[PDB]
Design a protein. Structure first.
Lengths: 51, 53
RNA sequence: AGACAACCUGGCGAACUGAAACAUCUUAGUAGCCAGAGGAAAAGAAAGCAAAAGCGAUUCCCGUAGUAGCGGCGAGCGAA
RNA sequence: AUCCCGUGUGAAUCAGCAAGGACCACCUUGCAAGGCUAAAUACUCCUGGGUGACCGAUAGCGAAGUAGUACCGUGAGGGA
RNA sequence: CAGUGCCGGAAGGUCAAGGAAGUUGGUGACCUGAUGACAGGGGAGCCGGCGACCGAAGCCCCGGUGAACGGCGGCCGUAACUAUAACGGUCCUAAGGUAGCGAAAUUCCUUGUCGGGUAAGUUCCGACCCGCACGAAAGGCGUAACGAUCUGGGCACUGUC
RNA sequence: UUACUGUUCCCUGGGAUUGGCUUUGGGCUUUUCCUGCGCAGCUUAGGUGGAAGGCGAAGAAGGCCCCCUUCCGGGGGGGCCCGAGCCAUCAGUGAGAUACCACUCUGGAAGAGCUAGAAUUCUAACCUUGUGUCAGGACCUACGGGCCAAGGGACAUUCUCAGGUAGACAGUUUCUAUGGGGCGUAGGCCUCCCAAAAGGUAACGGAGGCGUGCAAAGGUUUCCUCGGGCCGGACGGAGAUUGGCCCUCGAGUGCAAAGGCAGAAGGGAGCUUGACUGCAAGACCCACCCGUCGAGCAGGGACGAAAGUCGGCCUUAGUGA
């Protein structure tokens, strides 16, 4: 059905340097859920960008 | 939505409903105007007359 | 108690048009009609504007500004 | 936001109330629901004085002699 | 009476303003911790937003209603010579044109066939019927009288020829 | 006109003009009484508190019977009889005495209040009527004033908001191409031909597709590579699994065609998310708006021993300021 769906990091709203939600929309979920380790979040590396 | 005034009065002659010339039943605004004030069968509660009579 | 060139105040108040069509908007609260009054009328003495500094009833000209802003953020309108 | 209006509810007044562009505080200004008032200001059917790189006879007022005339229309009105 | 209209129902559903239990948000006396830079939670009150439930007609829904808007179907087979089908099977709608009339101010093909009229008549009258697309108060059929009506043939009368 | 947006007529609800009762019952109230079988037990343990005396002749325990509830274990309770007691840490039990109290929650009943709802109702304002009534110096059977009448009755009427609702009425639109117009087809992107050996190119000129799909059909590190003939082996069939010979890349590459690709871009495995963030010299196209490629750098990674490749998919459609 190819519905869009966006991914998201590990929020931790802080008083640090601009930290902030990092969505990355992607497509295709006609399945059960798919997380992925899209990275270069606010913090540099990342892992398990869910939803 | 809205209710209208329920206005205090004092009497001038016996009421076949509520009191014999003494009581202060807050009759209604649609009632003081016609039966009570045309027929002189009531007086409005003036703060002036109260503390002088 | 009738009359009036234009100017003025009030009430009612359009449309062709511009938007390259057109219903929000614009021509415009213009035109016109009615009602008053004056040589001028209306407004007017602060429940105002301002901005940590000051003003001091109204009414006009300049200028801020075709700026701020409003706007099918379109045509356009446009302060203080 | 201020500003005036139709319907219905409908405060307090100064150890108050309104405004400061929703609203809330603190501060600052002004204090409503009564009235009056000259000037600078817009105007011309007009009067007086003056001026014209304005016309001068199909121009200038439509009109340089009985010109809103003759004439035309029932009439508003048109008009040499 | 399927659709629409109208009328009568309106039991159930959707149903506006409005009313409203709550719930939420801002502001906020005072409260509290840290390097540096300021927040947070928060009485009251004042202002907001969302709102369970309630809220009529209307519509959905249910019946009557056609001199209310309107509509009135095809395909395939068989009969005593051959044919034409009295009679049957199928999808269909709400049903499938009744009586009369009919190539008709309605039939296109079309000067349709046939008869009468004419010497000869695509006009005309009477019929048949496959009514392209007639038809019952946007009435059907027929009518004596009447028509500065349209239409065909007559006798008389004539420069119409 | 069953085109769009609205207005008016009309219909309904809310508020205003708008009131007397006296009831029925919906939602808040506030005072009046039962309600309870976890098991150790004096035995159908109501939680939470004041908690050492209440309850009695304004007359109990006890038995005689009436009623109601019911898990026929017993509970509340009227009458009469009776006449000197039923009672507390007395121990059990998470929690206490049926001594007693405030109530109360487990829920249930009623006279008390708000606002409605409904019902009938009368009269004061409202609508309507009257040859009736009296007059002003005269009448007003010249409309009309006061007055009493008689009907109607807080409904209607008006005013405001809200929903529905007649093209009755208004303000407007209804595209262009089109080898005349209308009817028909067509309107954007991609590929091949016309396109005349760079690019570009027109026609209601000739052929087709697209408005996606893929967590992998992506990324890497590896390995092999199809077909279509013939020969073998049962059905097996012209064509299905299994071994040997020609081969031009005739196979495929998700979907159309063209160009491409057989150290493969063909197929299969291993791990993985680079279908990352900040970007970017220069180019190609080029009316503008758009669009396409991109060496290289930084961060942080995947794969790979390393070299290296990886910011989507063999390329061009799969998209709109």
């Amino acid at each position: 059905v190819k519905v869009i769906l966006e991914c998201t990091g590990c929020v931790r709203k802080s008083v640090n340097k601009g930290s902030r939600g990092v969505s990355r929309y992607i497509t295709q979920k006609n399945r059960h859920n798919t997380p992925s380790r899209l990275e270069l979040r606010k913090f540099c590396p990342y892992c398990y960008k869910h939803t | 939505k809205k209710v209208k005034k329920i206005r205090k009065i004092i009497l001038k002659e016996d009421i076949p409903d509520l009191g014999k010339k003494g009581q202060l039943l807050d009759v209604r605004a649609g009632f003081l105007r016609n039966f009570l004030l045309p027929l002189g069968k009531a007086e409005v509660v003036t703060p002036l007359l109260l503390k002088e009579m």
